[PDB]
From a paper:
Continuous well defined electron density is observed for the polypeptide backbone in the 1.95 Å resolution structure, corresponding to residues 91–282 of the native Siah1 sequence. One outlier is present in the lower resolution structure and 96.9% of the amino acids are situated in the most favoured region. In the lower resolution structure the r.m.s.d. is 5.36 Å (181 Cα positions). Inspection confirmed that the NCS breakdown is owing to differences in the orientation of the N-terminal zinc-finger subdomain with respect to the rest of the protein. Superposition of the two new structures on each other gives r.m.s.d. values of 0.80 and 4.89 Å for chains A (175 Cα atoms) and B (164 Cα atoms), respectively. The high value again occurs owing to a difference in the position of the N-terminal zinc-finger subdomain in the two structures.
Siah1 (seven-in-absentia homologue 1) is an E3 ligase belonging to the RING (really interesting new gene) domain family. It acts as a scaffolding protein and interacts with a variety of different substrates for ubiquitination and subsequent degradation. Siah1 functions in Ras, DNA-damage and hypoxia signalling pathways, and is implicated in various cancers. The SBD forms a dimerization interface with its counterpart from the partner subunit to create a Z-shaped structure.
Author numbering:
A (entry chain B): 95 to 282
B (entry chain A): 90 to 282
The structure:
């Protein structure tokens, strides 16, 4: 038996080595980290402190209001490890929209697009999101339940549990070097 | 009397004996029965060549392990997607008076990275293919991944589109989330457009 990493935050669970990694990802006593990806903010705090932190320390992150929006990522053929981030406001919540370009597999630059709720895991379960890329007679769609920012996105990226494509695919969908991602959030 | 210069059909070497004035050339050729087509089954094993109409018979007689499902909206189950031997899954779909070949391929296109590629091609011409769309959908616990495009024609083939990632492309990790007991169901819907 081993204690959870977040024991010092008030977590009581002791588990064997094999059950430890799964619990801590989903543990409630996990700190809410600055949800903006991926370097180099090291801020942590409570859920109610997240939106003010973004507003005070990440002023260039824009918000669009609506359930049905276009997240237009500019200059997607910019080389290397890039992030695009915006927030979407609907249903009384803010959602973090992230497009990340990273060399997850060696020699293969890929894009990962994912939505997170600024709120709890329990709250996140009432939502669904759709990410849709549109091209000339082409459409690529991903639909899932948004991750709570509590969980982060590193695990979903590693598991490809989000929309995954690459620079090859992106060319079908890009217009003037930009990528329009249709993001629809709905309740279930 | 000087008659005007005649042109042999571009499929003369395949047998076509008709010669024609230049204006009739394109109109005959894109209708000519002697046009050769390679075997559309992936990939390099079969060396058969023949007419468009000889294709589906070739697949029925020489590629008996390929199943044909009937209907515009089907499920293709790719079994044992995790087996190390497993490379290709092929199925035919019959609807709208045509036959469409669904191909799933597992490969390391980038070294060290195993990916699945899925695509549809029409047993027919590009012109015929351009009146269709196809949708591939993977379904899991609160997850859905969808790709929609115009079917490839068999003359163009699918190898080039796969190389370009102009098809459904996904990882072995996410394949697992969509798989049940080692099998991956792909919903395929063909539509007119
Ligand atoms: Cl809709
Ligand atoms: Cl799950
Ligand atoms: Cl439908
Ligand atoms: Zn814990
Ligand atoms: Zn921050
Ligand atoms: Zn001819
Ligand atoms: Zn053959």
């Amino acid at each position: 038996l081993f204690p959870c990493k977040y024991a010092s935050s008030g977590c009581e669970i002791t588990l064997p080595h094999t059950e430890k990694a799964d619990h801590e990802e989903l543990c409630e006593f996990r700190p809410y980290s600055c949800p903006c990806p991926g370097a180099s903010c090291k801020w942590q705090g409570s859920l109610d402190a997240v939106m003010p932190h973004l507003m005070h320390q990440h002023k260039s992150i824009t918000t669009l209001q609506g359930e049905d929006i276009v997240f237009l990522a500019t200059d997607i053929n910019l080389p290397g490890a890039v992030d695009w981030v915006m927030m979407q406001s609907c249903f009384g919540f803010h959602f973090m929209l992230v497009l990340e370009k990273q060399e997850k597999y060696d020699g293969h630059q890929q894009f990962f697009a994912i939505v997170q709720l600024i709120g709890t895991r329990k709250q996140a379960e009432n939502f669904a999101y759709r990410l849709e890329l549109n091209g000339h007679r082409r459409r690529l769609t991903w639909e899932a339940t948004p991750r709570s920012i509590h969980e982060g996105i590193a695990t979903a990226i590693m598991n490809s549990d989000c929309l995954v494509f690459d620079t090859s695919i992106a060319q079908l969908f890009a217009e003037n070097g930009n990528l329009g991602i249709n993001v629809t959030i709905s309740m279930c």
